[PDB]
Amino acid sequence: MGPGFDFAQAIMKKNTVIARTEKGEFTMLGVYDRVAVIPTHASVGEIIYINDVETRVLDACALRDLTDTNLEITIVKLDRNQKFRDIRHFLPRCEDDYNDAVLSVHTSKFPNMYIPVGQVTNYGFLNLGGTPTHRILMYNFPTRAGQCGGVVTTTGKVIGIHVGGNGAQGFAAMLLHSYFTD
C-alpha cells in the first residue's frame, strides 16, 4: 500500500525461503551467499527442507551473547546451488527502537502475508518459553502460531525475525550487522 509494504515486498520476493524442520514450517531469511537465519526453536539438524527440497546443512550456529544468554537466532549455511542477494547493508549496527515496522510471513499456511505492527520497543530481556533471552524487540500486535521466522522491517532496514508472542504482543530477535561479517 505504501513504502513500508514496498520494502517488505522486495525482501520477501528475493530473500526468503520456506524452511521445514521436524518442529514445523518457518519463514527463513537469506542474508548473503548460502547463509540464512531461523529461530533457534526450529531445532535445525543435518538435513532441512528448503521450498520442499532436501538440503544438507553445511553449518548451523545457535547465537548467544557474551553473558552466555540465548539470542534465539540460528545462522544456517545451506548446501544450495544458488546465492541470496546480499542484504547485509540493510542490517542495523546497534540495538535500537523503531517506528512503523512491518512483519512479513511466507509459508504454505500464510502466503504473501504483511502485517503493519507499528512502533517497535528495544525490550531487552524476555523469558521466552522458559528460556532467558536477550536483544528482544516488542510490538503491540496479537501475532499467532505460524508467524515464527517472519521478517521485521522498516523502510530501509531489516531489524529482526519474529520468535514468539503472548496473545497481545509479538517478540522478535534483533538482527545486527556484526552477526554476518566474514
Ligand SMILES: COC(=O)[C@@]1(c2ccc(C)cc2)CCNC1
Ligand atoms: C528491499 O528494498 C528494496 O530493495 C527497495 C526499497 C529500498 C529502500 C526503501 C526505503 C524502499 C524500497 C528498492 C526496490 N523496491 C524495494
